[PDB]
Structures are given as C-alpha cells and as structure tokens.
Design a protein around this ligand. Structure first.
Ligand code: HG
Length: 53
C-alpha cells in the first residue's frame, strides 16, 4: 500500500500506522478512508492529498 501526502502542509498518511484517533485503523488503504476524513494536522480534505510514488 502506498503512502499519501497532504499537498497543503506535508503530512504523510502511512497505511501501516493509519490514523486511529480519528477512526482510521492500521492497514487502511487511503482510498478506503471515509471520504469525510480530513488531514489530522491542518484539516483540509482528502482531495488535497496525492499518492507518493
Ligand atoms: Hg495537512
């Protein structure tokens, strides 16, 4: 599974860690994160994230 980065602030979503405090469990692919989730650091939506290749 690929990491994704917030292109506004630089936060990296790592699927191995998830974002458990906001209900995203370890092992969750970015695409499967509920679409109302926002960056835990700056609060922008999923549509500002890009795949890290
Ligand atoms: Hg951000």
């Amino acid at each position: 599974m690929k990491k994704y980065t917030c292109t506004v602030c630089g936060y990296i979503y790592n699927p191995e860690d998830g974002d458990p405090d906001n209900g995203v469990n370890p092992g969750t692919d970015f695409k499967d994160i509920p679409d109302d989730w926002v960056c835990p650091l700056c609060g922008v939506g999923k549509d500002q994230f890009e795949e890290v290749e």
